[PDB]
Amino acid sequence: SLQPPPQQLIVQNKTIDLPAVYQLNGGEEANPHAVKVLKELLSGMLISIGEKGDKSVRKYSRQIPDHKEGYYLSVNEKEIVLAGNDERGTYYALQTFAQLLKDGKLPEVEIKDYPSVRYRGVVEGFYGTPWSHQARLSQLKFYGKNKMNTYIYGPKDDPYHSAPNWRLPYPDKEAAQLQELVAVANENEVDFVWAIHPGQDIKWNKEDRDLLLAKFEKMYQLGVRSFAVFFDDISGEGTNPQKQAELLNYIDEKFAQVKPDINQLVMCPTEYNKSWSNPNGNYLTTLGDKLNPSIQIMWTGDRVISDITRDGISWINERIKRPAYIWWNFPVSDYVRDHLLLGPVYGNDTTIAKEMSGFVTNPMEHAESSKIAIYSVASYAWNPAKYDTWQTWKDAIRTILPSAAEELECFAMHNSDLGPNGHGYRREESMDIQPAAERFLKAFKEGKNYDKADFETLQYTFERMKESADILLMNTENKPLIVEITPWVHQFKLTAEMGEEVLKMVEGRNESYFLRKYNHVKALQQQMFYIDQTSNQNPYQPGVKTATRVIKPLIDRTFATVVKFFNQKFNAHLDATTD
Ligand SMILES: CN(N=O)C(=O)N[C@@H]1[C@@H](O)[C@H](O)[C@@H](CO)O[C@H]1O
Ligand SMILES: [Ca+2]
């Protein structure tokens, strides 16, 4: 089950063993990063590793795809061939090789691969608590594993990339940590893109221009080889696309064209989605016209939160006269901070790879939890035409938490919707039991017998959520993930219990039992409010919501309805509300 799926793949249905004795050909010649991975997989048979042009992979150079980051991989009993179009490609061959190895044994196959989107990875662009240094080292290694080549770096607690301290050099301590990120991004074939955010206090004069240049040069000396300049945050003169183009072209010419090894050079426009673009203005096409063709322009789609469509990307491509570099604002939850967004990644058109220069995801402030979407994005961006939302979602989860994948699946299935929000952006959730939920409720609401099978499905779900919750909380394979999701897990358990007791009210043996359940529900609704007042307290959407699209309303509505039915029956007046 390769992730991302290779462009071309032929499997033989024979299978050889990792050879106990082998002979490495190209050890000296291939990308050291890939070879290091090979040595670690290899802790006799001919294994050939190298890039196009290496003496070691001469025999196979017609098999190597002619694409940046492409590779040829081969496995049969005679030899193993791992051969890149360039260094990054060989490393990518090795990342695929590692997924093939299962029990010192390899399948016999032949693969020709390359990415369909040129740039792919993550932009650290969410409001909230910034990630720790450690979380970032871990992200970078996860990117290399999934062949993401882009990391746009922006922690919001580092003031040396924005007003006013962008002007200033990183202090020693922070510098060295930053170097460490760059070192790790290099080893894993990721472009560390340092992004500067000047728009707040930038002057259109030559001195500020020079200070930026020198800042870029300092980052260069610390190892950075890719750069972004942000203009989303600016006003007045600064909003002139003409002048933005001049400054960026200026940096291209005096800097990027002058160093030998500058990879990405990227800007974020002042109008970065169609809806905040002024059709009575000039901004985009002027930028398109005046900005050097090798400079990327970032774009989030039709609206701030938006999936990428064919209409959507034509519309921006026509204007900037190049393929947009997509900034996808999902799974970022910084405007729905009381939700986790753990669902699958979908909605982006799968036939538009030629039309986009980059694809990056803006993740949640929950770094590990974000790995589900991130792995899915890497898959989508590498081979959109073979993109399989749901298999890739299950694959991500099995990858992040193999020892409790079914449990994270159950939990994630019911934590994907945003609930109503200022952006009007929603996701599906709980689709598996939706039909049973809706039938049971329609029948139940109208005094009409519900179906036993729907009742049992709901029962079953609640039981399974409790099991999953409890396994999740005690799991120690990925502690960071568990630390991140714990409050919500507790909340998810409470939801399940609440569901169980309400269902017991529906089954309703006798009046006294019914009041026990009723009081137990009130008490549980009560601990949910507790958690929601004491956990995840942030200024904007403080708290913890879970299972909110289908499940909590099914339970609330079933509760109101059953109490109503109880009040008629016994001329009682129990409060029927869930709030
Ligand atoms: C491209 N871009 N800023 O340049 C953004 O997407 N910025 C913020 C982005 O940082 C934020 O996560 C979302 C949702 O809160 O709102 C956007 O406006
Ligand atoms: Ca070489």
mmCIF file of N, CA and C in Angstrom, residues 523-565:
data_model
loop_
_atom_site.group_PDB
_atom_site.id
_atom_site.type_symbol
_atom_site.label_atom_id
_atom_site.label_comp_id
_atom_site.label_asym_id
_atom_site.label_seq_id
_atom_site.Cartn_x
_atom_site.Cartn_y
_atom_site.Cartn_z
ATOM 1 N N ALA A 523 -26.413 15.044 35.102
ATOM 2 C CA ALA A 523 -25.096 15.088 35.699
ATOM 3 C C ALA A 523 -24.026 14.979 34.606
ATOM 4 N N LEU A 524 -24.197 14.090 33.627
ATOM 5 C CA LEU A 524 -23.198 14.013 32.578
ATOM 6 C C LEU A 524 -23.176 15.273 31.697
ATOM 7 N N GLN A 525 -24.327 15.912 31.472
ATOM 8 C CA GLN A 525 -24.324 17.092 30.601
ATOM 9 C C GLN A 525 -23.491 18.087 31.372
ATOM 10 N N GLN A 526 -23.725 18.058 32.668
ATOM 11 C CA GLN A 526 -22.946 18.851 33.583
ATOM 12 C C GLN A 526 -21.388 18.683 33.590
ATOM 13 N N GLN A 527 -20.854 17.467 33.588
ATOM 14 C CA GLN A 527 -19.390 17.348 33.427
ATOM 15 C C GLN A 527 -18.908 17.816 32.077
ATOM 16 N N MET A 528 -19.732 17.677 31.038
ATOM 17 C CA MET A 528 -19.356 18.234 29.731
ATOM 18 C C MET A 528 -19.203 19.744 29.812
ATOM 19 N N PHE A 529 -20.054 20.393 30.587
ATOM 20 C CA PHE A 529 -19.943 21.858 30.657
ATOM 21 C C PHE A 529 -18.667 22.185 31.431
ATOM 22 N N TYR A 530 -18.384 21.376 32.450
ATOM 23 C CA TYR A 530 -17.185 21.547 33.231
ATOM 24 C C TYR A 530 -15.935 21.532 32.322
ATOM 25 N N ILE A 531 -15.814 20.477 31.524
ATOM 26 C CA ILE A 531 -14.650 20.307 30.715
ATOM 27 C C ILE A 531 -14.550 21.476 29.758
ATOM 28 N N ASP A 532 -15.707 21.917 29.299
ATOM 29 C CA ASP A 532 -15.778 22.936 28.298
ATOM 30 C C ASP A 532 -15.475 24.308 28.903
ATOM 31 N N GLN A 533 -15.543 24.433 30.233
ATOM 32 C CA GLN A 533 -15.195 25.679 30.896
ATOM 33 C C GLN A 533 -13.773 25.699 31.456
ATOM 34 N N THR A 534 -13.141 24.529 31.594
ATOM 35 C CA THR A 534 -11.847 24.432 32.242
ATOM 36 C C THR A 534 -10.794 23.980 31.270
ATOM 37 N N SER A 535 -11.148 23.239 30.219
ATOM 38 C CA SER A 535 -10.120 22.846 29.217
ATOM 39 C C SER A 535 -10.030 23.727 27.999
ATOM 40 N N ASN A 536 -8.850 23.787 27.401
ATOM 41 C CA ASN A 536 -8.699 24.488 26.125
ATOM 42 C C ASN A 536 -9.275 25.898 26.200
ATOM 43 N N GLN A 537 -8.903 26.624 27.242
ATOM 44 C CA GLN A 537 -9.476 27.933 27.426
ATOM 45 C C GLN A 537 -8.663 28.965 26.637
ATOM 46 N N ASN A 538 -9.226 29.476 25.566
ATOM 47 C CA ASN A 538 -8.526 30.430 24.796
ATOM 48 C C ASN A 538 -9.516 31.591 24.609
ATOM 49 N N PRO A 539 -9.008 32.776 24.239
ATOM 50 C CA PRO A 539 -9.928 33.939 24.148
ATOM 51 C C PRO A 539 -11.072 33.808 23.134
ATOM 52 N N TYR A 540 -10.980 32.912 22.161
ATOM 53 C CA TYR A 540 -11.819 33.013 20.975
ATOM 54 C C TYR A 540 -12.890 31.957 20.856
ATOM 55 N N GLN A 541 -12.506 30.696 20.830
ATOM 56 C CA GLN A 541 -13.537 29.668 20.974
ATOM 57 C C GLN A 541 -13.057 28.742 22.076
ATOM 58 N N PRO A 542 -13.121 29.209 23.331
ATOM 59 C CA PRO A 542 -12.635 28.430 24.464
ATOM 60 C C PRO A 542 -13.426 27.107 24.569
ATOM 61 N N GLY A 543 -12.792 26.003 24.960
ATOM 62 C CA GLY A 543 -13.568 24.810 25.241
ATOM 63 C C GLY A 543 -13.321 23.568 24.420
ATOM 64 N N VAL A 544 -14.235 22.594 24.594
ATOM 65 C CA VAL A 544 -14.121 21.299 23.971
ATOM 66 C C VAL A 544 -15.459 20.746 23.482
ATOM 67 N N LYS A 545 -15.678 20.801 22.160
ATOM 68 C CA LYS A 545 -16.780 20.185 21.470
ATOM 69 C C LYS A 545 -16.318 18.963 20.656
ATOM 70 N N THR A 546 -17.199 17.969 20.555
ATOM 71 C CA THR A 546 -16.862 16.672 19.978
ATOM 72 C C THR A 546 -18.112 16.023 19.376
ATOM 73 N N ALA A 547 -17.938 15.125 18.428
ATOM 74 C CA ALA A 547 -19.123 14.456 17.845
ATOM 75 C C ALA A 547 -20.353 15.364 17.582
ATOM 76 N N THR A 548 -20.176 16.543 17.029
ATOM 77 C CA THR A 548 -21.216 17.652 17.049
ATOM 78 C C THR A 548 -22.170 17.720 15.883
ATOM 79 N N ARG A 549 -21.848 17.063 14.783
ATOM 80 C CA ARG A 549 -22.702 17.220 13.619
ATOM 81 C C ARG A 549 -23.967 16.352 13.677
ATOM 82 N N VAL A 550 -23.773 15.117 14.088
ATOM 83 C CA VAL A 550 -24.837 14.116 14.045
ATOM 84 C C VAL A 550 -25.095 13.614 15.475
ATOM 85 N N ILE A 551 -24.032 13.253 16.177
ATOM 86 C CA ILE A 551 -24.211 12.526 17.399
ATOM 87 C C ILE A 551 -24.763 13.325 18.555
ATOM 88 N N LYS A 552 -24.119 14.433 18.916
ATOM 89 C CA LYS A 552 -24.673 15.197 20.039
ATOM 90 C C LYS A 552 -26.142 15.677 19.731
ATOM 91 N N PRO A 553 -26.411 16.186 18.529
ATOM 92 C CA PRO A 553 -27.865 16.504 18.341
ATOM 93 C C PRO A 553 -28.814 15.252 18.392
ATOM 94 N N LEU A 554 -28.371 14.101 17.911
ATOM 95 C CA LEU A 554 -29.250 12.952 18.044
ATOM 96 C C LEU A 554 -29.559 12.723 19.523
ATOM 97 N N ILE A 555 -28.534 12.737 20.344
ATOM 98 C CA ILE A 555 -28.720 12.506 21.743
ATOM 99 C C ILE A 555 -29.612 13.628 22.357
ATOM 100 N N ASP A 556 -29.273 14.890 22.118
ATOM 101 C CA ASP A 556 -30.090 15.981 22.652
ATOM 102 C C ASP A 556 -31.545 15.863 22.236
ATOM 103 N N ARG A 557 -31.786 15.657 20.950
ATOM 104 C CA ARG A 557 -33.163 15.622 20.502
ATOM 105 C C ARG A 557 -33.918 14.404 21.026
ATOM 106 N N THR A 558 -33.219 13.281 21.154
ATOM 107 C CA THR A 558 -33.839 12.067 21.656
ATOM 108 C C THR A 558 -34.185 12.246 23.116
ATOM 109 N N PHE A 559 -33.310 12.958 23.817
ATOM 110 C CA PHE A 559 -33.521 13.293 25.232
ATOM 111 C C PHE A 559 -34.745 14.205 25.392
ATOM 112 N N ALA A 560 -34.817 15.272 24.612
ATOM 113 C CA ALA A 560 -35.970 16.164 24.739
ATOM 114 C C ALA A 560 -37.223 15.383 24.466
ATOM 115 N N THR A 561 -37.213 14.592 23.401
ATOM 116 C CA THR A 561 -38.421 13.895 23.001
ATOM 117 C C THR A 561 -38.842 12.891 24.084
ATOM 118 N N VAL A 562 -37.887 12.211 24.697
ATOM 119 C CA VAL A 562 -38.306 11.181 25.618
ATOM 120 C C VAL A 562 -38.858 11.795 26.894
ATOM 121 N N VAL A 563 -38.338 12.951 27.269
ATOM 122 C CA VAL A 563 -38.826 13.587 28.462
ATOM 123 C C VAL A 563 -40.250 14.079 28.220
ATOM 124 N N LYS A 564 -40.435 14.828 27.135
ATOM 125 C CA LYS A 564 -41.753 15.186 26.682
ATOM 126 C C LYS A 564 -42.711 13.995 26.841
ATOM 127 N N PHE A 565 -42.377 12.864 26.229
ATOM 128 C CA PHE A 565 -43.255 11.690 26.273
ATOM 129 C C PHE A 565 -43.516 11.284 27.708
#
